[PDB]
Amino acid sequence: AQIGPVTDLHITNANISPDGFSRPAVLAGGTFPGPTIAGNTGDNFQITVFNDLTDPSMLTDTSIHWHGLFQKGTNWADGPAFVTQCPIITGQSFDYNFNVPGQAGTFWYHSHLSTQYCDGLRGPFVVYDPNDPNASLYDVDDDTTIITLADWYHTLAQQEPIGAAITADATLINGLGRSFTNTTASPLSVITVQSGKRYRMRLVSISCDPNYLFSIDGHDMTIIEVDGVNSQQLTVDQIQIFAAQRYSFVLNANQPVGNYWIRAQPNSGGQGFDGGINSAILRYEGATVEDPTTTAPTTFSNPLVETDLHPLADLGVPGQPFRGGADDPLVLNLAFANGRFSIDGVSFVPPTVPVLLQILSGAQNAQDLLPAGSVISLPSNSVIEVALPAGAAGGPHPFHLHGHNFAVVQSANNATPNYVNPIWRDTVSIGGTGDNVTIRFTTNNPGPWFLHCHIDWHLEAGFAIVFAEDIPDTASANPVPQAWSDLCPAYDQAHNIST
Ligand SMILES: *[C@@H]1O[C@H](CO)[C@@H](O[C@@H]2O[C@H](CO)[C@@H](O)[C@H](O)[C@H]2NC(C)=O)[C@H](O)[C@H]1NC(C)=O
Ligand SMILES: *[C@@H]1O[C@H](CO)[C@@H](O[C@@H]2O[C@H](CO)[C@@H](O)[C@H](O)[C@H]2NC(C)=O)[C@H](O)[C@H]1NC(C)=O
Ligand SMILES: [Cu+2]
Ligand SMILES: [Cu+2]
Numbered sequence: 488a489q490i491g492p493v494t495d496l497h498i499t500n501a502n503i504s505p506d507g508f509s510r511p512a513v514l515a516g517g518t519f520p521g522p523t524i525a526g527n528t529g530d531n532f533q534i535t536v537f538n539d540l541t542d543p544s545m546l547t548d549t550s551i552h553w554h555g556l557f558q559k560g561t562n563w564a565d566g567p568a569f570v571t572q573c574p575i576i577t578g579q580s581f582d583y584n585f586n587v588p589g590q591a592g593t594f595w596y597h598s599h600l601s602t603q604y605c606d607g608l609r610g611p612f613v614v615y616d617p618n619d620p621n622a623s624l625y626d627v628d629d630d631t632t633i634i635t636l637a638d639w640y641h642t643l644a645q646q647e648p649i650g651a652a653i654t655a656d657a658t659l660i661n662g663l664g665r666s667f668t669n670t671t672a673s674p675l676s677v678i679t680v681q682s683g684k685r686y687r688m689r690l691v692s693i694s695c696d697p698n699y700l701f702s703i704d705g706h707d708m709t710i711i712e713v714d715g716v717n718s719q720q721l722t723v724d725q726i727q728i729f730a731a732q733r734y735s736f737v738l739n740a741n742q743p744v745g746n747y748w749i750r751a752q753p754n755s756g757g758q759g760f761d762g763g764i765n766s767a768i769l770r771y772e773g774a775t776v777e778d779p780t781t782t783a784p785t786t787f788s789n790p791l792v793e794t795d796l797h798p799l800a801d802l803g804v805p806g807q808p809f810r811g812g813a814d815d816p817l818v819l820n821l822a823f824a825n826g827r828f829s830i831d832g833v834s835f836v837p838p839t840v841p842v843l844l845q846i847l848s849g850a851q852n853a854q855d856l857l858p859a860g861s862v863i864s865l866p867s868n869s870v871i872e873v874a875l876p877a878g879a880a881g882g883p884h885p886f887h888l889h890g891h892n893f894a895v896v897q898s899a900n901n902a903t904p905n906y907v908n909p910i911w912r913d914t915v916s917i918g919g920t921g922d923n924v925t926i927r928f929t930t931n932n933p934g935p936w937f938l939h940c941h942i943d944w945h946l947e948a949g950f951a952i953v954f955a956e957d958i959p960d961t962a963s964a965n966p967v968p969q970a971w972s973d974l975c976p977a978y979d980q981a982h983n984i985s986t
């Protein structure tokens with residue numbers, strides 16, 4: 488069952504064996520992935536998070552981010568540790584109480600402390616639309632049509648060297664899959680469909696690192712949503728999905744009753760499908776209970792290309808139709824050396840006092856804010872352009888902005904910008920050497936918003952900056968509850984930190 492919009496959520500340690508290998512984990516709701524949190528557009532969510540963690544090897548503190556929800560007026564509930572809150576300590580709880588006006592689509596939630604989400608704290612978050620403009624395109628849309636793609640590691644995250652090329656041991660589809668080495672025939676996930684029906688498949692990357700080449704043998708996929716943003720219908724036979732992205736696609740159950748492989752090939756780790764790695768099963772009602780015998784093509788003739796996507800609504804692009812045609816045009820210098828990433832010459836290391844608390848305490852320009860050189864102020868009610876030229880090692884890097892979605896004016900692997908009708912989204916691959924992926928948005932949401940690569944190992948190695956949007960209005964826009972004001976004193980006391 489789905490939970491929410493008002494619910495408790497307990498965070499616990501437990502052993503799990505999703506690929507046949509047992510290891511301890513950090514779990515929401517006792518499962519991997521965690522339960523789906525759901526509601527309708529405009530609802531009040533009150534997710535009271537109970538930190539019941541006791542195993543220090545995966546950190547006993549926690550903090551949860553609601554990925555892609557704008558948090559307008561509730562910046563304190565966004566979740567990134569040391570940006571909008573101090574962590575919740577073990578044996579305590581915290582009510583994330585926020586609203587979702589003007590958003591409907593497919594989201595997710597995850598730990599936003601260190602690399603803790605890799606250790607298991609990740610799950611879907613769906614905001615349904617009772618008047619969805621795409622409703623007539625399918626018959627079924629429920630918890631059974633969510634498809635999660637996850638990387639899974641046998642080594643615990645706090646034992647992964649910082650700045651290393653860290654590689655997974657299994658791909659998990661809906662929580663199950665097989666290990667790349669020492670492969671055992673452990674159970675595969677089954678997605679069941681009825682011949683003739685149409686399904687809104689909500690494809691969610693909960694990855695800590697790899698991108699996946701996702702396809703379904705014999706089937707094609709009609710994209711209708713991108714990171715929460717309704718799209719024009721785009722039919723493809725493969726989707727390359729980067730960490731933290733989401734798509735909804737219509738699956739027409741229009742092939743002969745039978746079993747079909749669902750494939751998710753990561754860019755690192757095990758290549759191919761030997762032994763049923765990187766796989767799940769699409770089963771039609773009435774089919775024999777047996778593995779598929781289907782083949783992938785050698786090449787995919789209609790892969791997703793990001794410039795083919797266009798919004799369903801007339802969203803346009805803010806600003807003027809040329810590079811630098813914005814009120815505040817930025818170009819970030821994104822670099823890697825010696826195990827650490829940097830943005831504009833500064834490697835991110837979380838501050839002792841959360842950025843939001845520094846601003847509420849009176850620090851009111853970005854040079855007064857810590858970490859020094861890691862906070863850029865943005866002016867209010869202004870068009871912002873951010874160019875993100877690629878080349879730093881470890882690519883392709885999926886950059887994500889909190890508090891906002893954005894127009895993708897220039898996409899990976901294509902030098903031509905689009906100032907007319909590009910897709911809007913919240914996490915974007917910045918591509919390869921020589922690319923100049925560029926995003927635009929308008930500043931109508933005061934608060935400190937993290938900008939970072941969503942490969943969690945890269946964030947941990949410093950690939951982040953904070954946009955302090957409309958510092959002067961942050962305090963009046965974001966009144967804080969007493970329980971939020973209590974977090975930093977409790978955390979600092981528990982960890983013997985002075986501030
Ligand atoms: C990516 O595009 C940005 C503009 O959005 C380019 O920025 C210009 O860079 C040159 C130096 O390289 C400066 O003289 C300009 O002031 C910048 N802003 C402009 C022209 O509007 C950036 O060079 C591009 N990067 C790549 C790798 O193509
Ligand atoms: C490279 O990106 C550009 C810009 O998004 C794409 O150009 C558009 O192509 C569409 C589809 O044919 C035309 O309707 C638009 O007028 C083009 N816009 C511009 C500004 O040129 C282009 O198709 C992409 N290249 C590839 C190979 O997909
Ligand atoms: Cu996220
Ligand atoms: Cu986010």
Ligand SMILES: [Cu+2]
Pocket residue numbers: 881882883884885940941942945946950
């Ligand atoms: Cu990265």
Ligand SMILES: [Cu+2]
Pocket residue numbers: 552567599887889937939
């Ligand atoms: Cu983040």
Ligand code: NA
Pocket residue numbers: 803804805806
């Ligand atoms: Na415009």
